């Protein structure tokens, strides 16, 4: 599914994302917007290294989930990558939390550095009741 902005914001808040390891809801929104355009079914194959990015946060198969087809991969979220293509984002959120438990935090996504870091991201949650 493709989330509407404010519906997503409330969904992430309910799932405990607001302020998770120092990361504001608006940062998570900006990440989702630029990774996937709020689309849970988004996939992107990286021919370069044989990995794939899955779902609303575009989480990569090399480190984070198992798709069986990425060489040398590990599965730190301990999930099938299929779990990151559901309409319900709970598993994706649990995996995103796990990504940010590592030293880089949200910096693990380059799109965040490009489109979110050091920016005014307030617009993402304006009017959403969060
Ligand atoms: Cl911030
Ligand atoms: Cl699974
Ligand atoms: Cl679903």
Curated annotation (Swiss-Prot):
Its main location: secreted. The keyword Signal applies. It is found in: Secreted. Residues 1-130 form the C-type lysozyme domain. Its EC number is 3.2.1.17. Pfam families: Lys. GO terms for molecular function: identical protein binding; lysozyme activity. PROSITE patterns: GLYCOSYL_HYDROL_F22_1, GLYCOSYL_HYDROL_F22_2. It is an enzyme of class 3 (hydrolase). The active site is at residues 35, 53. Lysozymes have primarily a bacteriolytic function; those in tissues and body fluids are associated with the monocyte-macrophage system and enhance the activity of immunoagents. This is Lysozyme C. It comes from Homo sapiens.
């Amino acid at each position: 599914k493709v989330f509407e902005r404010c519906e997503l914001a409330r969904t992430l808040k309910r799932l405990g994302m607001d302020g998770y390891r120092g990361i504001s809801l608006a940062n998570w929104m900006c990440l989702a917007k630029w990774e996937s355009g709020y689309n849970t079914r988004a996939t992107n194959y990286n021919a370069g290294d044989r990995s794939t990015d899955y779902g609303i946060f575009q989480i990569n198969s090399r480190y984070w989930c198992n798709d069986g087809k990425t060489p040398g991969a590990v599965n730190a979220c301990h999930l099938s990558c299929s779990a990151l293509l559901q309409d319900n984002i709970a598993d994706a959120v649990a995996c995103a939390k796990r990504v940010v438990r590592d030293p880089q935090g949200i910096r693990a996504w380059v799109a965040w550095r490009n489109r979110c870091q050091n920016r005014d991201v307030r617009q993402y949650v304006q009017g959403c009741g969060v």
